[PDB]
Amino acid sequence: PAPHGGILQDLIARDALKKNELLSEAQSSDILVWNLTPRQLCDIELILNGGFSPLTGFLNENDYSSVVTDSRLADGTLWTIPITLDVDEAFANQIKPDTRIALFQDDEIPIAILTVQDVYKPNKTIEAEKVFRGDPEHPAISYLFNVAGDYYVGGSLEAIQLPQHYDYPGLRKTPAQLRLEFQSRQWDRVVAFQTRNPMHRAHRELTVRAAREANAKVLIHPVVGLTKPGDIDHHTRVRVYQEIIKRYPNGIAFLSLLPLAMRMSGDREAVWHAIIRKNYGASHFIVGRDHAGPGKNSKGVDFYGPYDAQELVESYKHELDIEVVPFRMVTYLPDEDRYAPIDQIDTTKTRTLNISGTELRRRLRVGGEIPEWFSYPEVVKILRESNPPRPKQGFSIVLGNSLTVSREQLSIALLSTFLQFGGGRYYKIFEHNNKTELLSLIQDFIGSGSGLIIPNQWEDDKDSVVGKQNVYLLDTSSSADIQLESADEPISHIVQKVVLFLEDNGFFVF
Amino acid sequence: PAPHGGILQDLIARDALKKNELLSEAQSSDILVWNLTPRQLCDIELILNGGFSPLTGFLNENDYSSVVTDSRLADGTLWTIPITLDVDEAFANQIKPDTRIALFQDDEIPIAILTVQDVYKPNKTIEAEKVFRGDPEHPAISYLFNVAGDYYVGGSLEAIQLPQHYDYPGLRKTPAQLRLEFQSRQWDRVVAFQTRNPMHRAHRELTVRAAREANAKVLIHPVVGLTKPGDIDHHTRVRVYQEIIKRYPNGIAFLSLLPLAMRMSGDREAVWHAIIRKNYGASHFIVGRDHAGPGKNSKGVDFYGPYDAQELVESYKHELDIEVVPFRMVTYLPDEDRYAPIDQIDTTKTRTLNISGTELRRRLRVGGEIPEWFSYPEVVKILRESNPPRPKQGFSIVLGNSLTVSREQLSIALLSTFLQFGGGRYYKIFEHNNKTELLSLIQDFIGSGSGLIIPNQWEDDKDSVVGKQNVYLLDTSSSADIQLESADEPISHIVQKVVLFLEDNGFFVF
Amino acid sequence: SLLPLAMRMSGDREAVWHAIIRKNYGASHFIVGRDHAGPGKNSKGVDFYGPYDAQELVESYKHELDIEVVPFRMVTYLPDEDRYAPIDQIDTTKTRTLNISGTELRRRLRVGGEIPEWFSYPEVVKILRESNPPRPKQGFSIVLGNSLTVSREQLSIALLSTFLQFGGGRYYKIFEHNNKTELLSLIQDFIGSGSGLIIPNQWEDDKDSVVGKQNVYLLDTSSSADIQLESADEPISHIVQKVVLFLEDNGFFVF
Ligand SMILES: Nc1ncnc2c1ncn2[C@@H]1O[C@H](COP(=O)(O)OS(=O)(=O)O)[C@@H](O)[C@H]1O
Ligand SMILES: Nc1ncnc2c1ncn2[C@@H]1O[C@H](COP(=O)(O)OS(=O)(=O)O)[C@@H](O)[C@H]1O
Ligand SMILES: Nc1ncnc2c1ncn2[C@@H]1O[C@H](COP(=O)(O)OS(=O)(=O)O)[C@@H](O)[C@H]1O
Ligand SMILES: [O-][Cl+2]([O-])[O-]
Ligand SMILES: [O-][Cl+2]([O-])[O-]
Ligand SMILES: [O-][Cl+2]([O-])[O-]
Ligand SMILES: [Ca+2]
Ligand SMILES: [Ca+2]
Ligand SMILES: [Ca+2]
Ligand SMILES: [Ca+2]
Ligand SMILES: [Ca+2]
Ligand SMILES: [Ca+2]
Ligand SMILES: [Ca+2]
Ligand SMILES: [Ca+2]
Ligand SMILES: [Mg+2]
Ligand SMILES: [Mg+2]
Ligand code: NA
Ligand code: NA
Ligand code: NA
Ligand code: NA
Ligand code: NA
Ligand code: NA
Ligand code: NA
Ligand code: NA
Ligand code: NA
Ligand code: NA
Ligand code: NA
Ligand code: NA
Ligand code: NA
Ligand code: NA
Ligand code: NA
């Protein structure tokens, strides 16, 4: 289909002969420089390559507010997610309209030149409520208030080069390249499948059914840009996709990585996704249950209805110009060994089965066996390998402030004790001295599977530098993960308490 | 047999009623304090429990030189290894005879009170040559010149408590306790087996043969104090021993950990070992091939003859008062599936087999399969787990000084590249800033299995803070582990070079 | 078809006899391989018959046997080609063979050794191992020698309790025979059943014939004792360790 807006805005192609000139202006000591934030790098790449056609820069206030209140650009073009360049007051104050800024990656690689159209201070509450539905726990809203700059800079781009990536060089196909890919193959019907999770059996069936319904080839188009916090890293997912792609009949599917930065914005994002895939050459786009939805909030309520995206996408149907293949909860059928849309069964006459991602983590974290029917073995293997069960996980024991015994001796006692268990885990008494350069390493070790014995707490002003993950507090306090009887409880007693606690939580298995 | 010298010098027992008093003197602000070095902690423990009977303190010059030149204490008592309290000039100068010093552990636990007899400055070259045979590579000699103090303090001890241990509380039996153990069992004939390595099939057969020959029970008496540099840690070995002990017939063997600090002194040490085992209640002591020998030097020559220890022990036979069970190279017999002393076979008529420890490390480092006949499976499992094959080992790539490319970008490239391989390894760009508190952590990560990308070298004055292990230098220099074509070689080129190098050395397997 | 013949292990003569018998039974051909009906070698290592005497004898009566004989030379294994073949149509060193004599076959059967996939079918080896178990599943007897000076009652109990702690499915029993042949004749039955017997006293030499020597060991100071004692009054724990290690050495116990 025609790219959204009618013209693929591949600015790398457009500005090619200006490459050298733009590069010189980018490195000239007089120009103002902004180092792109991670999410911005994702966005900037989708704007420069045509993925966000018709966009050609970051939204000015006029287009931005139109998108917030109208799900459309100022000119009426259907567009649901605001793409802006968020900066801080300091930087915002050094720019005026007509100014030209150099956009860098890693304060070293010049990406593009942005020509300023305006500098405004968005009402984050409105954006949060009109675009992401208001819940403070919604991922997009948390980013907007805790990570995003309080100033937006609308303006047009002139491309120097897409953001730098040293991984999967062959796979991050640009809209132009994908289209060429489909052509060399004479693929004129392609149904794209969005995703941010590893694909399991349900999804393989889901995508093949779509392939069959639409009479089209399959495009696994996963996000490797930025997804829901706590998601499986894209490296692991890529390995999973590459593995599962082999279970498709020869020549039916194509894999391409999309450096998109999701907002986990349910229905609106679904619309945005469809526009994006259309630019990339797809003729069909799947929209299953709770598409781009972040599940439930701490209170158990849904951020979006499991089918809000489908309804919204349906309502813009006549102007999306890319056919949407909707799917209802695809689930497992024990008694018949096969999956099927829940909309075409049940009646109690048929018994289903469904292993939610929740419980999926649970078995991964507990070395539990994951059903042959649920996911392919090679896939589960890759997953366990990246997310090991507790007996292979790292952790830390922090000797609480209330601790009266010799921290030096209690430390050694724990070390020598853990050491006798064996099991390949590396242990260390780790003294941080409140130096963030040391604190920031704590999660590295835990990530590496090591067990750390930390003799002292770190000041509360530093608590943010340390990832709470697998970090237990040994103390008399009620807020201690491992509660002691008294601050001066004898070492061997404290030791047994720590060991049995770790054993209870699966870190040790005898 | 009677402890060496006739009287078990169990000073803990002896000084019991002085415990409180000694403890008070030890913590009095007026007394001079020396914090025991690791090896000293091992020695002090064998002196206070009777293990070094007839010793009751650290050798004064008179006894010390008699041991060096006569293999005997000043009074004639057979004794081959000098046990001295080595200190630095600074401390040496603060003491005179009659002075009482408090000996602490971890500058916190008071171990004993040493009454000074003399303070001398040993000629380390004579000790090195007469006691350890002079080769600068010999482990004991290296310790003597690079770790030992240049001053010795002779003097008698008064025990407060044996050095503190939090691991294997039940297993570190003292001479008094072992003897009771043997008695409760009515064991009056016990052959002890010394060792610093994991026990394999040969050893199990070797010890049972000795049990059969001597008509005695088996005592596995492994060293967990200090051994040959690069040995398997004692925790792993203890797990190996506890596992292999089950392969003995019910009630034929007993396990006990010996906190001895070996000197790897071949024949002399064997004499010393036999004296120590006699104090511990043994009636027989095994002395196999190259007992307590450190193998060969860099030039390939032997530190000791494979049977020097046997000859030396044989010559003191009538005064050791503990029977020695000598063994020649025990080897494997394929065609008959059984082991046997090489002295009772060969003639070419029989074909043998022998997997040296060398080649044993090799398979352990290469994930190679280790023969069913060589060692029990449960044992190899424990070993592989403590010494994983390369694909599970950590490492560091240090961006050489000669590097002209962007270190920041080359670092990222390697990170992203390694990230796509997967396999459970944790990666990190690690900036040390020449701070030893960071440098000293490099080997911790490697130990934890992580891969580190280090953008800059550390100043030569710090090089000693970092363990050379699995640390590779990427540079144009000839001394670079991974040699670059030019200092400005393009990143993808450098990356492929680093990846293929690591693949070639087994860190990556596809 | 099962033939209730009583062989004489008479090499060549028997082969002639066998061929006559097979002819009566309806056969038109009879095979005569290497050392047919031969009992191998005597204690001095010499052959009772030449490996092909039977073939020669059968060949000489060929015209009156009236049953055709199919002769075969040593059929052996060919590693490199995975196949068997008559030795008469190979060798020349150009080809390497392989041959697991019955001797060595018993050896592995008695030592739980693995018997080559090429040598015999698995289902067959299974049936054999099951009828002729390896040592760790075999029975045996320890006979307390005459020279024994220690309490036979206490030494018996000690060995019983000791063996009992090893476990492994073997049944144990202190077995008093009282020189009664009705009891002696049962000794091999238990051994056959896999049990371990502790026998406090020897049986009079006139009865020795009633007992099968198989897996029966003599614990004594004598030189003819299978398990030799230092002195007739060696302390029990010492004697016990000696008996345990001896049995361990001969595979009856595996830890
Ligand atoms: N069981 C299912 N039934 C129907 N659709 C599904 C099912 N599971 C996943 N999908 C669809 O698969 C696509 C990607 O799934 P996910 O990776 O879990 O999350 S999403 O944030 O990208 O939507 C979405 O269209 C989603 O609705
Ligand atoms: N193959 C062997 N043949 C004879 N003796 C051996 C053999 N292997 C090890 N030993 C003996 O086993 C004891 C301990 O072995 P090791 O742990 O390797 O080394 S040692 O440093 O404690 O001597 C020594 O008496 C040694 O000589
Ligand atoms: N390897 C062999 N090569 C040739 N003939 C063999 C071989 N093995 C067994 N035979 C033959 O097989 C027949 C029966 O073999 P056996 O049961 O071992 O012994 S026999 O006592 O009945 O002759 C005989 O004709 C014997 O010569
Ligand atoms: O299905 Cl993934 O969440 O593991
Ligand atoms: O025997 Cl050890 O060297 O592994
Ligand atoms: O001797 Cl038989 O072939 O077992
Ligand atoms: Ca703000
Ligand atoms: Ca719901
Ligand atoms: Ca108290
Ligand atoms: Ca010095
Ligand atoms: Ca040699
Ligand atoms: Ca150059
Ligand atoms: Ca012959
Ligand atoms: Ca006697
Ligand atoms: Mg890119
Ligand atoms: Mg101790
Ligand atoms: Na920089
Ligand atoms: Na509001
Ligand atoms: Na259609
Ligand atoms: Na809704
Ligand atoms: Na169209
Ligand atoms: Na619990
Ligand atoms: Na004695
Ligand atoms: Na301290
Ligand atoms: Na002896
Ligand atoms: Na020699
Ligand atoms: Na003596
Ligand atoms: Na190589
Ligand atoms: Na003949
Ligand atoms: Na005839
Ligand atoms: Na033997």
mmCIF file of C-alpha atoms and ligand atoms in Angstrom, chain A residues 123 125-126 129-130, ligand 18:
data_model
loop_
_atom_site.group_PDB
_atom_site.id
_atom_site.type_symbol
_atom_site.label_atom_id
_atom_site.label_comp_id
_atom_site.label_asym_id
_atom_site.label_seq_id
_atom_site.Cartn_x
_atom_site.Cartn_y
_atom_site.Cartn_z
ATOM 1 C CA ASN A 123 0.888 20.111 29.853
ATOM 2 C CA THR A 125 -1.242 15.921 32.573
ATOM 3 C CA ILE A 126 -3.361 16.362 29.447
ATOM 4 C CA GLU A 129 -4.842 11.642 30.278
ATOM 5 C CA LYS A 130 -5.903 12.111 26.627
HETATM 6 NA NA NA D 18 -7.366 16.249 34.226
#
